[PDB]
Amino acid sequence: SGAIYVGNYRVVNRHLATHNDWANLVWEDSSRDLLVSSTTAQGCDTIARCDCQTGVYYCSSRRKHYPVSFSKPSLIFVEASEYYPARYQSHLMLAVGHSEPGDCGGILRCQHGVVGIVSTGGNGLVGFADVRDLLWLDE
């Protein structure tokens, strides 16, 4: 679990969005595993606007943060789960690091701000849905 709170927006994994997220829907994209809903309270998380390929993510299945080197956002094939059929997920960044399904939502940050959230993983890999291209999150 986990979310990003920026301005009047909440960014979560689409497959973990709640009934309230869908009732306050701003934008969603199944191919990215992202959903953004509106909030009444102001968030003040900062979104990175950069080309970093290193950062630190939070891993809830270890209660720890780990440093990572990750690939640039790209189209990656993700095997079927209970949430989606087998498909290409876009804007996904992969790195070597521990993850389990419930780690989805953990934040990846660089020195400039939030980069993205855990969205995929397995066998010593962890994948992050990028949010740095969503320029409207700041207005």
Ligand X SMILES: COc1ccc(Cl)cc1OC(=O)N1CCC[C@H](C(N)=O)C1
Q: Which residues are annotated as a binding site?
A: 50, 52, 110, 112
Closest CA to 117 of 48, 63, 62, 51: 48
Of 26 and 52, CB closest to Zn ion? 52
Residue appearing with tokens 């290193």 = 54
Binding site members for Zn(2+):
50, 52, 110, 112
Tell me the number of residues near ligand X by CB under 6 A. Answer: 17
* Nearest distance, CB of residue 114 and ligand X, angstroms: 17
Backbone torsions φ then ψ of 53, nearest 5 degrees: -120, 15
Q: Given the rule CB under 6 A, which of 2-10, 67-75, 107-115, 119-127 is the region that contacts ligand X?
A: 119-127
What is the phi/psi pair of residue 102, to 5°? -70, -5
The answer to whether 17 and 37 have CB atoms below 8 angstroms apart is yes
Q: Which does 122 bind (CB under 5 to 8 A by kind): Zn ion, ligand X, none?
A: ligand X
* Cα–Cα distance measured from residue 9 to residue 59, given in angstroms and rounded to the nearest whole number: 23
Among 17, 36, 118, 137, binds ligand X (CB under 6 A): 118
Side chain identity, residue 78: V
Residues at the contact surface with ligand X, assessed by CB under 6 A: 15, 33, 78, 81, 83-84, 89, 99-101, 103-104, 118-122
